[PDB]
Design a protein around this ligand. Structure first.
Ligand SMILES: [Ca+2]
Lengths: 290, 297
């Protein structure tokens, strides 16, 4: 029993060469693509998307391999779940809708797709907002004891299959809820709509979806890092105007090294900005994208 | 139906204030305490301990909380599973046998107990051997992307309870065999006696034992690190003559050059690599046993 958390939004299955992207589409006006991260699905936008839909055509997409999007076959390099490949697939999806120049807000893994998209194909983006991330390279470059403990899952989920898949299968419901809760300000699931938690829980209950998530993190440890590294070493900066939002529980300083036009603000929230702080997140997003 | 892998060794249940230490005890001569690590038990010594027992009174102990040793209840600081506490508990155990001055060889977590013992209570040790470790501080200090991937379990098992415990609980056999396999040279279980594997698997099958292992790793991420940090920043060196053995394909050598590291920690340290994965006494029993007999003699 999965609730429709985007009343008035259409549901589109967008064909790409790598499989279907599922998206809820609402509103009218300039196209704005919203990308979720881990361990969520597009429904994480359910509290801010209607506010954006007042001014934009809002496309709330499941990342390749996530949610109801198709899961492209991975390979030894985790290619389809590299942010470069997911960005390419989402570019293809947006082209199916006739959107070759669009606004993009990404959270978590979707924000990684988003800034990789901005680096690879900046002409595709009017404006970019990234929610509660630093570039993948920065996470690995600042890897120390404190980060390793805090984002242990970056190294755990990146272990070779089937180690994470098997351990995740030990208690998937616990794991996804533990991830949701532990990264909120409150530390529990109270920030979330329980119908949204059900979406996340059901997606996480599928072993194939969990494997994709590990592929994403495997990409995150390997090719994504290498792709970011090439840009760092080449001085490649994001030229799209961008907003960096982060949960108070210095990202702007970091993003300034990656982006030529970045503004930023802390949001009184944990990691899940659009759900813990939907009004402030939605406000900042409309202000920026308007 | 767990095999006796120490024929002719006795068995001792040693009372301490923090619970009983199980140990196999054999040989005669100077006391030599052997400490296993994760995810093993004292039986990992079963191929080298008889050779040692020709020269030494060999005490092959399960670490506090591991194997058949009792499991003291942990606390918010994981105190009984800090290497400091384990060392004090094993010192107490050894005193019960009348060993107030003994040789010590540790592997993995037991090697962490061992060098912490040597830092806290160096007068208890005649000589110290640590097998395939660097100090906990050094692993954390060198925890970059490559190392965080290699020893992810350092951060995974240190996650707050019950996260690792819940994931381990779904298929404990898989994880213990995965870790045994992945840290060997071959990358499989072929180096191990299958009877020893059964010991490891049975110990790991107990959810309380798994929790203790996570507590060990939690202590490893927090108090153990802090204890080490104080010593390294105070320039405190182990004064006990020590031997650092590591596997050419082991974990220690992935973080740095182990002898260079240990010389920062120990005033009198010799080192040798052994062609082996992490599990020196089982992958390379003869070479390990020879290095230890030679050093402790
Ligand atoms: Ca459970």
């Amino acid at each position: 029993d999965l609730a429709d958390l985007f009343p008035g939004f259409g549901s589109e299955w967008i064909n790409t060469s790598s499989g279907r992207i599922f998206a809820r589409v609402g509103g009218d006006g300039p196209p704005l693509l919203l990308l979720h991260g881990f361990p969520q699905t597009h429904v994480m936008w359910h509290r801010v998307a209607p506010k954006l839909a007042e001014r934009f055509k809002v496309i709330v997409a499941d990342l390749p391999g996530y949610g109801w999007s198709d899961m492209p076959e991975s390979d030894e390099q985790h290619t389809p779940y590299t942010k470069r490949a997911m960005a390419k697939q989402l570019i293809e999806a947006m082209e199916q809708l006739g959107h070759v120049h669009f606004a993009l807000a990404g959270h978590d893994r979707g924000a990684r797709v988003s800034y990789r998209l901005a680096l690879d194909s900046p002409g595709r983006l009017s404006k970019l907002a990234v929610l509660d991330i630093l570039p993948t390279y920065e996470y690995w470059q600042r890897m120390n004891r404190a980060y390793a403990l805090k984002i242990y899952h970056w190294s755990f989920l990146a272990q070779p299959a089937p180690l994470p898949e098997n351990l995740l299968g030990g208690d998937p419901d616990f794991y996804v809820k533990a991830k949701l809760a532990s990264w909120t300000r409150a530390g529990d699931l109270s920030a979330f709509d329980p119908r949204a938690v059900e979406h996340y829980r059901i997606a996480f209950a599928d072993p194939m979806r969990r494997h994709v998530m590990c592929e994403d993190y495997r990409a995150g440890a390997y090719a994504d890092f290498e792709h970011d590294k090439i840009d760092v070493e080449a001085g490649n900066k994001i030229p799209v105007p961008m907003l960096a939002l982060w949960g108070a529980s210095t990202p702007l300083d970091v993003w300034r090294k990656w982006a030529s036009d970045v503004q930023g603000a802390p949001i009184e929230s944990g990691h899940f900005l659009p759900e813990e702080a939907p009004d402030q997140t939605a406000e900042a997003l409309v202000r920026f994208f308007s």
